[PDB]
Every structure is written in structure tokens, then in C-alpha cells.
Design a protein around this ligand. Structure first.
Ligand SMILES: [Zn+2]
Length: 165
């Protein structure tokens, strides 16, 4: 999966990621609304709002907006774990639920494994927004029992042993 780079401006760092920290975990979220990942990033990096994320992936494209060598306020967990040292991945089109979501999820898989490989994050550190504080973000994944599946998919790169064929 190809990641786009339109990372946030240094002047916006201290509203999206004022601190610098190395990510040890990964936090996956599902989108409650449908939009291309590029839309989410363009919006998020320019926001004044506390909540930020690193990489957004949709069915079409994957775009990263917050530098991974910095924090991301995502969980509202303050200084606990993910807000400080996790990678926030936002799956776009989760609201759309259908084909756009299925690709977006599959695309996140490929993206997420890269972080596990590069930053040395075990699949055991991939957590939900609820796993830190309790905001239900991966709604689709949690409700349909697709979280564990996603996690196994990320483990290898989509075609891990979790899809019976
Ligand atoms: Zn969230």
C-alpha cells in the first residue's frame, strides 16, 4: 500500500503533537463517516482540535499526516499510552461498511505491518481507542469480531492464517 506524505507543519506541531516520542503501540480507529483518507488528513493536520492521528487509510489511498517520530492525541488518554507513544491509524469508509471499507481495512493491514516491522511494535500493541480509554472507534471491527482477524491479517500482511480457505 502506498502512503502519501503531507505531514503537518512544524508550527502546528504543538496542537497535534507538541511532544516528540517514539511509538511503541498502534491504535486503530474506524471512521464514523465516509471520506477519502486524504480528506481526513488534510482536515486533521489543519485542526485546532486536540485530536490528531498519524496515518489514515482508505480504499483508494493512504495518507500520513502526523510524523511517526512524534506523538498523536487520539485516544484522549492524556499521557497514558497511545496519546504519547502510539501510532494512530484511521480506517476510512468504515461508515460505508461495504467494498470501500473492506479495501480500506485491507489497506490498513499492509500499512500497519510496516510500522511493526520498522518501529518494532508487536501485534500485541495494536489496540483500539477503547482499549486505552473506551471510545468505541473500531465499531465495525469490534461488533463483527473482525478485530482479531485484522490483527492476524496485519501479523503477516493480509494473507495470514486467519481466513479459512
Ligand atoms: Zn478514535
Amino acid at each position: 500500500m502506498e502512503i502519501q506524505k503531507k505531514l503537518v507543519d512544524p508550527s502546528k506541531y504543538g496542537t497535534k503533537c507538541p511532544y516528540t516520542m517514539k511509538p511503541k503501540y498502534i491504535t486503530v480507529h474506524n471512521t464514523y463517516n465516509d471520506a477519502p483518507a486524504e480528506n481526513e488528513v488534510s482536515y486533521m493536520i489543519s485542526n485546532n482540535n486536540e485530536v490528531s492521528f498519524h496515518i489514515a487509510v482508505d480504499d483508494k489511498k493512504a495518507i500520513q499526516g502526523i510524523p511517526l517520530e512524534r506523538n498523536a492525541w487520539a485516544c484522549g488518554d492524556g499521557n497514558g499510552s497511545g496519546n504519547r507513544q502510539s501510532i494512530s491509524v484511521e480506517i476510512c469508509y468504515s461508515k460505508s461498511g461495504g467494498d470501500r471499507y473492506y479495501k480500506a481495512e485491507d489497506n490498513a493491514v499492509d500499512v500497519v505491518r510496516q510500522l511493526m516491522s520498522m518501529y518494532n511494535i508487536p501485534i500485541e500493541n495494536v489496540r483500539t481507542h477503547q482499549s486505552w480509554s473506551g471510545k468505541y472507534c473500531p465499531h465495525r471491527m469490534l461488533a463483527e469480531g473482525r478485530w482479531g482477524a485484522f490483527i492476524q491479517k496485519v501479523k503477516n500482511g493480509n494473507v495470514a492464517t486467519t481466513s479459512p480457505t
